[PDB]
């Protein structure tokens, strides 16, 4: 593949993040940085902090630009304050160029780095519309299209480290067919679900509480995350069809964990999960199926596990125990998302079509 070298260019895991190395400045200084399709700020450790290894040093920055004026990001979890400057940026396992971007230098934050997640800063691949102070500041992948000719789509590959294929799609990456479905808004990367079930069970409930108020993909959020209604529902689904076994109910809600002998953990007793996405022709969807190694994620002998399905007040987030299932392909140029089998007795399947009417009606106005 002509890909090749941004093959494995990810580390991570789902409950920390995936990073990917980033180059900024002159002379160089590389940084680990969190590959986050939930925000759309580009920002970096500036500072000596107790959970970083190393941190941007602007004053060794020839090129670097103060635009003197600060910036407060609050997250869903956690939150920053910076200066906003310009300096000049390179992925050395991603595309062959260097852009100056926008950079926020991180002085000071809260419950935003992690201890042990081995990054130092973030990479927001969202919209405009969403950034911080407000969409005047152009996100590091606008800047990368603007001033290059890479194309615009990425596409991504968590394990399952992982790939970030910035440009086009690497078909080592995947087995059958890529399957799209549209970004309903250019901000987060907002998708339409429109149906869903637990082991070919229907959950029966309307399809516009599946993206109340939003349905959002979002590599820096480990879970998939459900509005209150929908996540009772499914709960009790999921409890039901596994009731070859008894847990817990603070196992459901993530209050407590369940531990195996090495090796025993008895995957055949949970149900799988489909969701069933928009897709691009009228009435036609598709689906994407989640096994209990996604949605049941390892936290001596013993392997302990936490249920990765919660509670969310702002819409569902589909988080990195999804996106392990499958390569995702950001294609922003045509304005859709593709799922397809990662490369990385049942198997995660992205299958299709099927006959969905009124999807129209599935999203919040
Ligand atoms: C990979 C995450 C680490 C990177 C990280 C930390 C803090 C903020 C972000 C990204 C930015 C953004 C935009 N991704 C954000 O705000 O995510 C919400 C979030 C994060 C996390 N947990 C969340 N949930 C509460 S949970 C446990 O249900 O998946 C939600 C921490 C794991």
């Known amino acids: 593949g002509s890909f090749v070298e941004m093959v494995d260019n990810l580390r991570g895991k789902s409950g920390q993040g995936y990073y990917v190395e980033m180059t900024v400045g002159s002379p160089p200084q590389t940084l680990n940085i969190l590959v986050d399709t939930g925000s759309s700020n580009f920002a970096v450790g500036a500072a000596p902090h107790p959970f970083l ?80 102070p407000d969409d005047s500041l152009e996100p590091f992948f606008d800047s990368l299209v603007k001033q290059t000719h890479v194309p615009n789509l990425f596409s991504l590959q968590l ?70 209604k929908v996540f009772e529902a499914a709960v009790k689904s999921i409890k039901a069809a596994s009731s070859t076994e008894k847990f817990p109910d603070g196992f459901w809600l993530g209050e407590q964990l369940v531990c195996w002998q090495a090796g025993t953990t008895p995957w055949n007793i949970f149900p799988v999960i489909s969701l069933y996405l928009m897709g691009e022709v009228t009435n036609q969807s598709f689906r994407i199926t989640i096994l209990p190694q996604q949605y049941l994620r390892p936290v001596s002998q013993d392997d302990c596990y936490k249920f990765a399905i919660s509670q969310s007040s702002t819409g569902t987030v589909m988080g990195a125990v999804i996106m392990e299932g499958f390569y995702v392909v950001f294609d922003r140029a045509r304005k859709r998302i593709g799922f397809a089998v990662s490369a990385c007795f049942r198997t995660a399947a992205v299958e299709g079509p099927f006959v969905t009417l009124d999807m129209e009606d599935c999203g919040y106005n």
């Open 53 to 132: 290894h190393r941190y941007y040093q602007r004053q060794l920055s020839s090129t670097y630009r103060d635009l003197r004026k600060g910036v407060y990001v609050p997250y869903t979890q956690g939150a920053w304050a910076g200066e906003l400057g310009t300096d000049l940026v390179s992925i050395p396992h991603g595309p062959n160029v260097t852009v100056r971007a926008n950079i926020a230098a991180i002085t000071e934050s809260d419950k935003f780095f992690i201890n042990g997640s081995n990054w130092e800063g973030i990479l927001g691949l969202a919209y405009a519309e969403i950034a911080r």
């Open 159 to 228: 394990c399952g480290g992982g790939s970030m294929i910035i440009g086009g799609i690497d078909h080592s990456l995947y087995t059958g067919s890529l399957w799209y479905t549209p970004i309903r808004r250019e901000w987060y990367y907002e998708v339409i679900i429109v149906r869903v079930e637990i082991n070919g069970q229907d959950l029966k409930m309307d399809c516009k509480e599946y993206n109340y108020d939003k349905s959002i993909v979002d590599s820096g959020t480990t879970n998939l995350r459900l509005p209150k």
